[PDB]
């Protein structure tokens, strides 16, 4: 007994019931993933500020 | 594939911590010891009645293995292990391509 394989029918309606949610952007963003050397220097500068 | 008999590569031994000459050999799995806890447990489980108590793999699919190179640093005599990609024919110190 074969069945349907795939479809995107009704998915946009589901997404729009509560979406499309845009996360609130804060003034300061996380520094994870940035150049480690630059972050090290910035931390030292803040320490001696 | 053919790999050279010797290789200059990094050695993380405290004595060297740098690139040194290494001799290249092929790793071989050592003999299974009857004193290993897993083997002892398996032997205890198999004893008595009940037949085979653990799975026995049958559906072999791979036609090759991953060759591991044993690089023994000539300075400190310590060994590092380096796998290579799957191959059907492997040799060490073979004649160079003409």
């Amino acid at each position: 007994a074969k069945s349907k394989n795939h479809t995107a029918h009704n998915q946009s309606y589901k997404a729009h019931r509560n979406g499309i949610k845009k996360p609130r952007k804060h003034r300061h963003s996380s520094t994870k993933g940035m150049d480690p050397k630059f972050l090290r220097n910035q931390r030292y500068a803040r320490k001696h500020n | 594939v053919n790999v050279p008999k010797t290789k200059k590569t990094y050695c993380k031994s405290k004595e060297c911590k740098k690139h040194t000459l290494h001799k290249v050999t092929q790793y071989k799995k050592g003999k299974d010891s009857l004193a290993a806890q897993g083997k002892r447990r398996y032997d205890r489980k198999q004893s008595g009645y009940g037949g085979q108590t653990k799975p026995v793999f049958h559906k072999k699919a791979k036609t090759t293995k991953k060759i591991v190179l044993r690089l023994q640093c000539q300075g400190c005599k310590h060994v590092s292990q380096h796998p290579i990609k799957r191959c059907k024919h492997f040799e060490i110190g073979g004649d160079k391509k003409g």
Binding site: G19, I20, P23, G33, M34, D35 | -
Partner: protein, 163 residues
């Protein structure tokens, strides 16, 4: 993976422009990128390192990191019922400085100048620009009028250049 390779369906997207292949002009490597800059992602098919995924091609994002050869870009991506700020690293060859905010600083400066002038003369004004509105009335000078009528039909003219 899962039925589609990394560069699947990129025959046209990642190809280079006609008669524009070969060496890359030096201007690409002389650009300056800084945190907060808006950039456009345009994949150069000749640079295979630091290539963004095809999805980010043709999308504009903001710079959040600056390495030796690449720049970090934050690009919005819609996944079901929310927008994800996906952070990627892309080589400068694949990125171009965006003009999406070129007029902002100019407009702010002019608004500040106009507000200062209005305050000097003791008036209250709005510096907001407005959409094009209806035009007022005006007089048009009479001239010779050319009459337009429907064309009599001719089957022989149904083909481009005639049958």
């Amino acid at each position: 993976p899962a039925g589609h390779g990394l560069r699947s369906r990129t025959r046209d997207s990642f190809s280079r422009a006609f008669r524009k292949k070969g060496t890359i002009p030096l201007s690409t490597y002389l650009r300056i990128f800084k945190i907060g800059d808006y950039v456009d992602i345009k994949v150069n098919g000749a640079i295979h390192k630091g290539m963004p995924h095809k999805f980010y091609h043709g999308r504009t994002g903001r710079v959040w990191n600056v390495t030796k050869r690449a720049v970090g870009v934050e690009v919005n991506k819609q996944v079901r019922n929310k927008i994800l700020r996906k952070r990627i690293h892309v080589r400068i060859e694949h990125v171009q400085l965006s003009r999406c905010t070129e007029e902002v600083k100019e407009r702010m400066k002019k608004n500040d100048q106009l507000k200062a002038e209005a305050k000097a003369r003791g008036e209250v004004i709005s510096t907001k620009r407005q959409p094009v509105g209806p035009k007022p009335g005006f007089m048009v000078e009479g001239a010779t009028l050319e009459t337009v009528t429907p064309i009599p039909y001719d089957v022989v003219n149904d083909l481009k250049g005639g049958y």
